[PDB]
């Protein structure tokens, strides 16, 4: 019935920058103050930074500083590091022995501009064997997130085949990286001959390119 | 002091579940146990807490679904029925100080599925170069972990020894219903002729173990 309403849902800000999360509750907290805050990254349980609104969890950065009562508290993060890069959750308790956490928040470092560094990747000798072709496309240690992938096949624009992946941004460069996987059949790949991955990105003036050719190294 | 979850596994809907929290270091007759539950790609979500005495509480949408009990003085179970594709999560328990799910102290997670679907292990096929010398001074090098369910794989390199320059991809799920992962590492390119890269893939769901080396292709 009760409602928790974290705000905003993503914020992006620069190294020595600060933040603001907000949760408001429909309904006071538990002594007026047992309000919790969790950072989480991708794989890990969430580790407290807060509780009781204000204590600083041990070993938790000063960084990190908690403010509010009744139902609205706030989380500031100022002197904002690479290693911030995270999932924020406030969890309340309440009378009637309640737990709730809000729906959480991404927190983006945002650092200049950086061009990824592109690999490509032929179909292995034993997957061949099984009918299937993979070709990979890998972009490395980018900034911002966003990325175009096109696939060329003989020069023809491949569309519907292919899959990303994306990290969660890098707690000490603030880059991401993201894979491309291009899903051809034995049969398909082995019809064409010259296959490349095309890259656009903010940090390139112009796509870039990378390709091979079928059975030539 | 730590908790480790076990118990996490692939059942098929409506059969009951099982997990087990093992607790190490502290005493159950001092602090509570805290289930908690996320999604894929979701938020986290309080499911409930059993007390020093053995009494238990949940969330208001629980409905008597679960049930939580002290099995020995290291181990708590929680016990799951009439489960569905929406209780797929990752599945964690940790130390309560009090009736607040407030704490320092979480297991790293067991992964519940499910599904109707079948077990299948994955096969690791090499990301590799054509040449040490295509991309310069840097190498990239990588395995594709391709075709298995469900989750999850794991994946290290050199039996954990190199961390540094190391993405693990996502999975991605495949229009097949089964699951792909790729993991990738740039290296030195001057010493790709005499270092060892090894992916260590591990899919426990179906006792897969592969370590796979990964260099540049001869020509
Ligand atoms: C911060 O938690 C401590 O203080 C609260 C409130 O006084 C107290 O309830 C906690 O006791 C534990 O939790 C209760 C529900 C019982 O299970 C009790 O047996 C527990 O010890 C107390 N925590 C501790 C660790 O003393």
């Known amino acids: 019935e009760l409602d928790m309403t974290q705000t905003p849902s993503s914020v992006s800000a620069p190294v020595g920058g600060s933040v603001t999360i907000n949760c408001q509750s429909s309904?006071?907290?538990?002594?007026?103050?047992?309000l919790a805050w969790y950072q989480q990254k991708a794989g890990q349980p969430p580790k407290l930074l807060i509780y009781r609104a204000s204590t600083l969890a041990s070993g938790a950065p000063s960084r990190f500083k908690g403010s509010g009562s009744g139902t609205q508290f706030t989380l500031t993060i100022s002197d904002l590091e690479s290693d911030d890069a995270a999932t924020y959750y406030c969890?309340?308790?309440?009378?009637?022995?309640?737990?709730?956490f809000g729906g959480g928040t991404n927190v983006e470092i945002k650092r200049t501009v950086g061009a990824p560094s592109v690999f490509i990747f032929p179909p292995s000798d034993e997957q061949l064997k099984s009918g299937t072709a993979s070709v990979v496309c890998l972009l490395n240690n980018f900034y911002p997130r966003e990325a175009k992938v096109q696939w060329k096949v003989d020069n023809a624009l491949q569309s519907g085949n292919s899959q990303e992946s994306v990290t969660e941004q890098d707690s000490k460069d603030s880059t991401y990286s993201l894979s491309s996987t291009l899903t051809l059949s034995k049969a398909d790949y082995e019809k064409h001959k010259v296959y490349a991955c095309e890259v656009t990105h903010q940090g390139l003036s112009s796509p870039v390119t990378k390709s091979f050719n079928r059975g030539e190294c | 002091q730590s908790l480790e979850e076990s118990g996490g596994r692939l059942v098929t809907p409506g059969t009951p579940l099982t997990l087990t929290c093992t607790v190490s270091?502290?005493?159950?007759?001092?602090?509570?146990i805290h289930w908690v539950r996320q999604a894929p790609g979701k938020g986290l979500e309080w499911i409930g807490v059993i007390d020093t005495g053995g009494g238990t509480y949940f969330a208001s949408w629980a409905k008597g679904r679960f049930a939580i009990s002290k099995t020995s003085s290291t181990t708590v179970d929680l016990k799951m029925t009439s489960l569905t594709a929406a209780d797929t999560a990752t599945y964690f328990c940790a130390k309560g100080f009090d009736y607040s799910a407030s704490t320092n102290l979480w297991g790293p997670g067991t992964l519940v599925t499910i599904s109707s679907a079948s077990t299948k292990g994955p096969s690791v096929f090499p990301l590799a170069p054509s040449s040490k010398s295509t991309s310069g001074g840097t190498a990239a090098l990588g395995c594709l972990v391709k075709d298995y369910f469900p989750e999850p794989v794991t994946v290290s390199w050199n039996s954990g020894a190199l961390t540094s320059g190391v993405h693990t991809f996502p999975a991605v799920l495949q229009s097949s219903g089964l699951y792909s992962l790729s993991s990738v590492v740039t290296v030195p390119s001057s010493s790709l002729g005499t270092q060892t890269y090894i992916c260590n893939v591990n899919h426990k769901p179906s006792n897969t173990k592969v370590d796979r080396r990964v260099e540049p292709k001869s020509c």
């Open positions: 270091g502290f005493s159950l007759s001092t602090y509570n």
């Open positions: 309904q006071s907290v538990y002594g007026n103050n047992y």
């Open positions: 969890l309340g308790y309440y009378n009637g022995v309640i737990n709730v």
